Amino acid sequence: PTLRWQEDPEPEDENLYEKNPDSHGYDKDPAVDVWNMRVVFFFGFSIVLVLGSTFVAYLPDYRMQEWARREAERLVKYREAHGLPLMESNCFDPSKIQLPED
């Protein structure tokens, strides 16, 4: 014969429909739901996502890319025009180095 509590039987369950059947996301103030739908589907997509996609679709050449294409064209035309072999090894001058010898 004991109860150990005083409070109400919980959870008293809630149903977001059946009082405002035109409902988007949150609670039953009827105008501000339309304000929410307006602000997220305009100011989240129609000014953010597709516009940022067209922003990042082309932009300055990230990591030197077409710059390196045209520089590769010019330098390979150079090294094939002078007879010397392209991409010579020993990337620094062996006269401009001093080994600690044996």
Binding residues (CB under 8 A) for other proteins: these are 13-17, 21-27, 29, 32, 35-37, 39-64, 66
In whole angstroms, how close is the CB of 72 to other proteins at the nearest point?
Answer: 15
Contacts of 28 (CB under 8 A, 6+ apart): 16, 19, 20
Taking the least distance from each CB to other proteins, the nearer of 42 and 76 is 42
CB 70, min distance to other proteins, A: 9
Q: How far is the CB of 57 from other proteins (least distance, A)?
A: 6
Residue pair 37/25 in contact (Cβ under 8 Å)? The answer is yes
The Cα 47–Cα 95 span in angstroms is 60
